[PDB]
């Protein structure tokens, strides 16, 4: 139950069908989603949060797809859910290629810049109360946002 959002879950389901990107396996996939939405919420309905708002977008799709051919919305409100999952994959992947390119960089270590001190050197008042603020604030963030 630890997936990075709804779009992330779709990429898992949409995955299964291998083949190309979509290829009309929608009507099917949609069901699978609600499945985990209702069955898993039968007992533990605590981390729904955002996913919920997604359940909604699907409802309309399943529904509005029933009605016959009256710029069709029964469709656009489908092809768009596809584009969303695709573009998400693209970044879910580009994401990995960064955590990989980073690793190489992380193999190298260096030293904190030696704080030189010279007599003649005079102070430049280019810093202000705002600076000193974000400064201490940051250090607070960095570490605190971690365990």
């Amino acid at each position: 139950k630890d997936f990075e959002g709804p779009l992330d879950l779709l990429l898992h389901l949409v995955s299964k069908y291998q083949m190309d990107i979509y290829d009309v396996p929608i009507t099917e996939v949609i069901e699978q989603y609600l499945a985990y939405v209702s069955t898993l919420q039968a007992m533990r309905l605590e981390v729904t949060g955002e996913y919920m708002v997604m359940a909604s977008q699907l409802m309309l799709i399943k529904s509005r797809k029933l009605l016959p051919k009256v710029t069709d919305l029964g469709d656009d409100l489908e092809q768009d859910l596809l584009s969303q999952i695709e573009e998400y994959r693209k970044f879910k992947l580009l994401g990995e290629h960064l955590e990989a390119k980073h690793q190489e960089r992380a193999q190298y270590y260096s030293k904190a810049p030696t704080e030189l001190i010279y007599e003649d050197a005079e102070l430049v008042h280019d810093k202000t109360t705002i600076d000193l603020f974000l400064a201490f604030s940051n250090i607070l963030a960095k570490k605190k946002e971690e365990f």
Partner: protein, 166 residues
């Protein structure tokens, strides 16, 4: 030596590194000549089996670092922010900014599917991304980009050097 002068400075700067340009305005040599010494240097280190250093060029600056092997050792001792990996969320959120740059918080959330508020902060706390432009909407949105540190963190000199969607 000129090799000795370069190392000396490059050492003092450490993690901050120095730019070829700025190295000339200090040694008094042509920017093209530093390039040459800098290569002889990184090579002097390469050969020396008793040397742990290595020259590296990220974000258009040359930085004095440790040869990749000693990472196993140092990993215990250092753990400086640049060697720490990132959470999948920040990693992915970062990717989106990295490319769709300049971008907005909502746009990211949209693309990413969930709320990015948490990542934007963490990433910004690490000086990886910074807010530059502004947005003309019925909300005065803010635009997010990448800092020079982002190049360094990625070990590249120019943004274009990022992998490509193939």
């Amino acid at each position: 030596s000129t090799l000795a002068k370069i190392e000396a400075l490059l050492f003092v700067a450490g993690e901050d590194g120095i730019r070829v340009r700025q190295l000339a305005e200090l040694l008094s040599l042509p920017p093209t000549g530093i390039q040459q010494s800098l290569g002889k240097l990184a090579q002097k280190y390469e050969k020396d089996p008793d040397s742990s250093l290595a020259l590296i060029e990220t974000s258009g600056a040359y930085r004095l670092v440790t040869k990749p092997q000693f990472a196993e050792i140092l990993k215990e001792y250092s753990k400086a922010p640049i060697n720490q990996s990132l959470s999948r969320a920040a990693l992915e959120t970062l990717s989106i900014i990295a490319y769709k740059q300049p971008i907005t918080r909502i746009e990211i959330d949209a693309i990413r599917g969930v709320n990015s508020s948490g990542a934007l902060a963490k990433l910004q706390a690490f000086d990886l991304i910074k807010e530059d432009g502004k947005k003309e909407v019925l909300g005065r949105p803010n635009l997010y980009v990448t800092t020079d540190y982002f190049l360094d963190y990625m070990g590249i000199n120019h943004l274009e050097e990022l992998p490509v969607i193939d």
